[PDB]
Design a protein around this ligand. Structure first.
Ligand code: CFM
Ligand code: CFM
Ligand SMILES: [Ca+2]
Ligand SMILES: [Ca+2]
Lengths: 467, 522, 522, 468
């Protein structure tokens, strides 16, 4: 239908002023496109900031560390327990993920600088939460603008207390999206944490050590990945960020292979661990049977025959289980058209799982992804399907209106818009408080969930029997 | 594993043995976790009176705040106006957060834009972002008004909002009398309630300041009602209902109840209802202006008294019996309208409910938090029910507020064990409910983490949460309820008594142990 | 012992050691109690599939009934009329019980008299009790009407109510046209709903039967609404509200919402509001009559169709989305009034709430009981929410009702695991929630004893109660709520979703055990 | 003022017809009155039936027995778990007090008789509740009127199954109040249960065996009595009805003394156990310090010096505790006037406890009590105070209106009337879901409950500020 799509893009864009029209035309394509620059002012971008990329996705999930949102009270509040990066711990005692530690800037701190307040905050953190294994200080916008040196404070205090204090200059004005904040967070781990055990040779490694890099355990996602990799004989030394401890991060230079799930947020440190430590890395996809199977086979191919045998045994165990899932739910979802919009991995990665339930993904797009993500997307998506980079509120509403999908999978700022339009909606960020969606057990929940929402009785009652 | 007819989500899936052993292997192999016996030791120390002393010596560290930042408020203020785009000059990450925060509380679309100031703007001002931002916004989303506020980035580098808006009108990016009220809302001064006030005062100045010589006080025979930061649909709706019952001409200035509750009928409505620009221009002609939440509307009070020349009544928030009475009686004498038999009856039904329920409510101890006016109205109503408001927390309270609440506590025998805490937060309150255990807490969803902390010590130490406030994210549709008026007092009375009776049934549901008191009738 | 600053009521006082040892001594010395190990054994047998089979073979023994007797209904019918004394010819013990039963549900005065038939009346009729009874009642309590029903004593000895009332008018004990409608309401036929129907049909005959030649159908342009046995103030109030929103002329025939909710203002009001005698006399002139709860209003339907010549619409109880729509549309075409934008919006807000909440509601399994129309409307609305009504119990249901509900279950994929049980009781249901465990139960307070029985087996087996029905004695002021209309559907949706989320928080409130799923946002 | 009271009675009574006026005048007195006959038709009597007296108060509380309300579904429902006669057990397995077992009469049972249905009901009870230690069958009105013989069914079935099945002909038409039902229930225990162990000599008695007779453990009331009596050295073999087992009832002929709390409901069987077994009996009062103390001393005086010593030690232990209660609450309740209305013991018995908190009881009255209860009341009440027997709804409303009391203590059918009038109210039946009110540490609960309701904030709030 390629000219309908070509003509659609053009029509939506006429409501704009001129430099908006030109820029957004570059960011809308029929399956090339340009990606990752700035958002156009006043157009209701779905994108967050560099702070969200650092505190919200990379640092925040690290369990036994205290993360300090250094700045005013806002950022720490809105991001308090918003993302479901699951963990095992005793919160407030040894684990701290769902708490909000903030320096709560007042006008005296803006005017004079917040570094003496940060120094005293670090001591207070130490007397009240003795069992923390480290501290991060996540900069909000003001910090960089008023010229604070949180690095000085981190070194002097870190030395004084013999504790790891990571300064992260992830100010929301920095970059164009959450993406730069991910980069800043990876470099923050590189410079202040990862190298700590380069001298230490006392970790007893094995030929099967691996680390899950870039699985943030949304709804248990990483736990459902790990079980499969470990049943296949491999040892998961580290889980990056989701339910991760600081000592696992410190131990990741000891593994034989790094398994990158989220490429956009973790490719940076993966490239660095292959440079400095020689550790090879690979991308995998644990969304749906097809992809979890090809991934399990490809990871096993990097090792010996005993891991390839265990791989085929694991595939055999779960094969009755996912075949029952497709037998139940694929009749119920066949030929339904899905339109997607998430951030930097999921727009591409979940397609496989939808196809295993006989669904067609007719449109997908990323908030903050780069071009190397869009080169990966091309292959996964079909012909004449719609691609959209940093879609505006207006645009997404207008595309759905025309294309008329059976399911929309996006974030919370999109959810209630489409449900009012009669389109079924599933959050593809928080999983709509469900999940895990990774692995085989995750496919059963995913499939249960697309079904419960797309074939719900409520959608047939959007119109009154009188109008 | 998974059984396809009984699919398990995260809970209870990770309770299966192969998962439980897997996590045990993770902890032991790689986490270098503290010994469980040590975690317990430190947990028991976090519950002590010694810890609590160290907790209140905090000067630099805020843990688990019970407030948000100024621009959040400015957005909710702005949504209350007809076909108005809230617009926050500065960083875009902010707007994604304010939208999400409100989306999860109301479970509705929250429309608001940013002009996406990057690093370039930090060194050269956000002037072009204001120019392009307002132009694109006007054309893409078709608003009759755009209400501009700011994020910290724009405040720290001192962008003159006024100049930036005037230069974008001059250069032709937006029409010269397209409405763009503004307010500087710095995240580091006050809180979200301060941003609601600043925004309202800015919109009031925009429609009024330069046109006062034409206005006569009392000529439209109406009373203006400024709601404040309000996140219950039933509070907007009940004020209106009661005023209409009285046959009192009114003008609710900032009214978001339609946008925050549009119907699911096949179409999305970006805008709905709200206070018209005509009501804002004609507002000086009102007999007076009533401030429903006066402790966070001080700037607004000075503008309505100083420029509009209204004699704003010294009225508390209309919460509880006495203050809803005082409200209706002020409205009665400003408008000259008598209080109808319907509201006199509704007052009597509330007093009837109080007499039916007092045996279960009497002497009940509460820890509670929230915004200043919500907290003092809840404290007043608890004293009226014969309950003890033992721990009163208001992170964004000021010294004068604290003195006004200690004064209302002093006048009651039920306020003798009560203490008001301003500038303190939910980690502070976590200690007060351990060392001076109340029966329940009345607060927002952040209080669920205090309840599981008290259960960890043991069942005898558990302090249940009663969700009344903002934000309520872990329950559905409680944003529809009412805390103001007699209606609101009836809903809180029914929640407080039934939470109490629920907990009694829970404590007496044990066969041949405690069920001798598992009474059919209570 | 007792500490005077912390006084202990029965719970937890008998948990003190000197009490615990004292009760242990009582049991051991004098009770000849069964061995605890044997009590456990028998308890575990009461939970089995084998026990359940023996439980459904009961022919003579009813245990824990979910119904009451005919005259209870007749009293509630009667209270709905203006300045009317319910009067139950027969035994006085009955009237003390009907008054208490309703007093505890509404927490209000319930006025009703007896003519105190003793043993003497058994052998010589209660004729003098009717004569004196009505005379004393008329003079002591000043009613404009007295509505007479009967207790079993008066039914078994066959007192002719009609003759007894005519002879007391003749002998001059009461004025010859003082209103005394009657109904024979035998406790051993049907249930309390049958008594409401019989009473209404008797009052309708009293104001109508002998004056029909004067009446023209449709001349007053109103629609009559017969409510049925209704114990929620919000159901009377919502029917009225919606009809007034439509601008539909109506007449609610039997309306107790004012007497059952008088204000506490220094005076007791024996009577308040209610349907006037003038509305009952003019009722044949209505365009039609709508029966809100038709499955217990069969006698009434035959009289309004047969004597008033109204064409009663085939409408189900207006519960849930589809049946409230069908109700408003019938009202729209009988009256010729269009459905206003307000009700079209309220329908949309309900559908919006449904779409916001469906993920937590989907596939949820319920056991539920109650009166016939309440149960089928709750079953319909649960099917609309995507929930499974697994155990449908209606002790006072009939075979045709069962077929009408199996038919609505058959039309939905969510009714495939559902079974409807008529003539069965709460001990029967105690077994179905053990052997085919649902998630929750929706029922009255008698269900609290089923919940503590399921917790005794263990936490995994506990089935929580959601109190919706009659009687609700162990919670305060839930008699004020609403189960009908869109309003009612919004209240049930919010209770069902939040009971579910509460139980999830309860199951995930354990530190480092299950709290990984103790989510802030749900 | 005795003439204000005299004139009050007369005024209230003018709204009546003639035979009502004459009869009610006899039932209203300034402290001489007639009691226990019939209620006048159509006058909203607060009284229940003989079924309530039997199933509701005597039989229902017996824990390990199943009580069958034999008749239609009504009675069993309305009385299901309405009275808080507390017990320790596993309900539905070995204990059954809060369950409703009924024969649920339909028209076929009325027409043909319910005795074959009763016989099959007994078998069903035995297969489903194996651990019951006995069965009662409480007749509702129809049973006596249709001529059923539940005694035949009880004997044949009781023999067949070797189980105690007590037939109780407590039909609500029988008698004039709950009172006859109590009598019928006492005679039902006498004829079918109490004599079972007259042959059995294997119970090892002691000189200090006693039984609490007529404490129905409302809110734990009996447990708070028993603890005190046993601390004083005595052994409580039985507790009659409240948390009582059938074997305790069967063992009561082995005690040395019967302690009657409720005289109106248990005097009948107490007189019988003194005739047949020689067991002396006495009335006591465990409401408030004064009365619990004189009672503990009087019970102790029936035994030796070691029980009188233990008595004085027990009095000494609880003396700091009740003195703190009066020190806290008596300043708060001094001079407040109480008007009461309960059934057959409490109108007289709680006065002591109110006086220990400096309260004056200005009016009291009974629903179903006899004249021997009103001879006991005379002494307890002051001069010119109002007495009322089987008070009508109209009368109680009119007396309160005039007398203007600070507290009303009555039942559930009265509670919400007076709260609407601005008068503080405490239920003196169910204790308003509070209690125990017996003994020393039930006095603590009593005292804070009268205070919480009388000095509650809501009472100052009944008039709208714009109505003044
Ligand atoms: S929007 Fe993932 S690159 Fe990042 S919070 Fe979601 S599509 Fe992020 S997969 Fe991940 S757990 Fe994410 S869902 Fe990469 S971590 S900045 Mo919003
Ligand atoms: S009204 Fe007792 S003679 Fe009987 S239920 Fe209450 S004043 Fe009864 S003391 Fe007792 S526990 Fe009673 S309180 Fe005699 S048992 S038929 Mo209603
Ligand atoms: Ca919504
Ligand atoms: Ca009431």
């Amino acid at each position: 239908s390629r000219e309908e799509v070509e003509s659609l893009i053009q029509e939506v864009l006429e409501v704009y002023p001129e430099k908006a029209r030109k820029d957004r035309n570059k960011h809308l394509a029929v399956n090339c496109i340009i990606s990752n620059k700035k958002s156009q002012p006043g157009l209701m971008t779905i994108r967050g900031c560099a702070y969200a990329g650092s505190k919200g996705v990379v640092w925040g999930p690290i369990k036994d560390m205290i993360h300090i949102s250094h700045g005013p009270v806002g950022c720490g509040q809105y991001s308090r327990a918003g993302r479901r990066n699951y963990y095992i711990g005793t919160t407030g005692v040894n684990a701290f993920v769902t708490m909000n530690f903030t320096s709560d800037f007042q006008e005296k701190d803006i005017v004079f600088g917040g570094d003496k307040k940060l120094a005293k905050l670090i001591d207070e953190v130490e007397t009240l939460f003795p069992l923390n294994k480290g501290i991060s200080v996540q900069s909000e916008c003001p910090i960089g603008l008023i010229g604070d040196d949180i690095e000085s404070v981190s070194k002097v205090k870190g030395a004084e207390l013999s504790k790891t204090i990571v300064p992260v200059r992830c100010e929301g004005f920095r970059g164009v999206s959450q993406s730069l904040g991910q980069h800043i967070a990876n470099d923050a781990v590189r410079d202040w944490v990862l190298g700590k055990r380069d001298e230490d040779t006392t970790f007893a490694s094995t030929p099967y050590d691996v680390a899950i890099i870039g699985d943030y355990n949304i709804g248990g996602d990483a736990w459902s990945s790990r079980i499969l990799l470990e049943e296949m004989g491999l040892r998961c030394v580290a889980q990056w960020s989701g339910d991760g401890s600081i000592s696992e991060i410190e131990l990741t230079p000891k593994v034989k292979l790094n398994l990158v799930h989220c490429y956009r947020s973790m490719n940076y440190i993966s490239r660095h661990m292959e440079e400095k430590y020689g550790i090879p890395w690979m991308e995998y996809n644990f969304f749906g049977p097809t992809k979890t199977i090809e991934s399990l086979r490809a990871i096993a191919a990097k090792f010996d025959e005993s891991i390839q045998k265990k791989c085929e045994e694991v595939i055999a165990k779960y094969k009755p289980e996912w075949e029952a899932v497709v037998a139940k739910y694929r009749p119920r979802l066949e030929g339904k058209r899905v339109m997607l919009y998430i951030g930097g991995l999921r727009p591409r990665h979940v397609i496989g799982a939808y196809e295993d339930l006989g669904m067609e993904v007719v449109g997908t797009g990323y908030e903050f992804a780069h071009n190397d993500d869009y080169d990966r997307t091309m292959k996964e998506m079909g012909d004449s399907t719609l691609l959209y980079d940093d879609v505006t509120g207006y645009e997404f509403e207008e595309f759905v209106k025309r294309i008329k999908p059976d399911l929309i999978g996006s974030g919370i700022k999109e959810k209630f818009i489409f449900q009012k339009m009669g389109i079924p909606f599933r959050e593809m960020h928080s999983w709509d408080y469900s999940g895990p969606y990774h692995g085989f057990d995750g496919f059963a929940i995913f499939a249960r969930d697309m079904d419960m929402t797309l074939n719900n009785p409520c959608w047939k009652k959007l119109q009154a029997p009188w109008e | 594993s998974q059984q396809v007819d009984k699919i398990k989500a995260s809970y209870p899936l990770f309770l299966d043995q192969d998962y439980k052993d897997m996590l045990a292997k993770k902890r032991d192999g790689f986490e270098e976790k503290y010994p469980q016996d040590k975690i317990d030791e430190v947990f028991q120390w976090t519950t002590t009176k010694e810890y609590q002393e160290l907790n209140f010596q905090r000067e630099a560290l805020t843990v688990n705040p019970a407030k948000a930042c100024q621009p959040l408020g400015a957005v909710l203020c702005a949504l209350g106006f007809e076909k108005t785009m809230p617009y926050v000059h500065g960083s875009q990450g902010c707007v994604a957060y304010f939208r999400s925060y409100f989306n999860r509380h109301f479970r509705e679309p929250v429309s608001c834009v940013s002009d996406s100031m990057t690093e370039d703007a930090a060194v050269f001002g956000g002037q072009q972002n204001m120019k392009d931002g307002l132009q694109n916004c006007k054309a893409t989303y078709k608003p009759d008004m755009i209400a501009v506020s700011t994020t910290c980035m724009a405040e720290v580098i001192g962008d003159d909002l006024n100049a930036f808006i005037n230069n974008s009108k001059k250069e032709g990016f937006i029409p010269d009398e397209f409405p763009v009220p503004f307010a500087h809302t710095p995240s580091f001064v006050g809180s979200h309630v301060t941003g609601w006030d600043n925004m309202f005062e800015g919109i009031a100045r925009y429609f009024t300041l330069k046109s006062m010589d034409d206005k006569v006080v009392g000529s439209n025979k109406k009373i203006n009602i400024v709601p404040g930061f309000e996140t219950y649909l039933g509070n907007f709706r009940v004020i209106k209902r009661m005023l209409s019952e009285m046959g009192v001409g009114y003008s609710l200035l900032s009214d978001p109840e339609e946008v925050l509750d549009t119907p699911a009928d096949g179409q999305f409505r970006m805008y709905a209802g709200g206070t018209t620009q005509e009501e804002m221009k004609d507002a000086p002609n009102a007999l007076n202006t009533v401030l429903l939440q006066p402790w966070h509307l001080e700037k607004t009070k000075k503008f309505v008294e100083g420029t509009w020349k209204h004699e704003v009544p010294k009225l508390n928030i209309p919460m509880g019996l006495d203050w809803t009475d005082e409200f209706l009686m002020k409205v009665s004498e400003i408008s000259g309208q008598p209080i109808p038999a319907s509201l006199t009856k509704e007052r009597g039904r509330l007093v009837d409910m109080m007499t039916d329920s007092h045996t279960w409510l009497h002497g009940k101890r509460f820890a509670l938090w929230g915004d200043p006016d919500f907290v003092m109205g809840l404290v007043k109503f608890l004293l009226e029910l014969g309950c003890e408001p033992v721990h009163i927390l208001c992170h964004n309270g000021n010294k004068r507020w604290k003195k006004a609440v200690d004064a209302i506590l002093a006048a009651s025998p039920y306020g003798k064990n009560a203490t008001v805490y301003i500038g303190k937060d939910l980690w502070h309150l976590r200690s007060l409910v351990f060392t001076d255990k109340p029966d329940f807490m009345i607060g927002n969803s952040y209080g669920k983490f205090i309840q599981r902390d008290t259960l960890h010590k043991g069942k005898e130490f558990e302090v249940p949460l009663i969700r009344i406030g903002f934000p309520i994210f872990d329950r559905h549709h409680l944003h529809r309820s009412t805390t103001l008026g007699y209606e609101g007092a009836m809903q809180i009375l029914t929640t407080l008594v039934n939470s109490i009776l629920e907990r009694l049934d829970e404590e007496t549901r044990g066969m041949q142990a405690t069920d001798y008191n598992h009474d059919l009738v209570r």
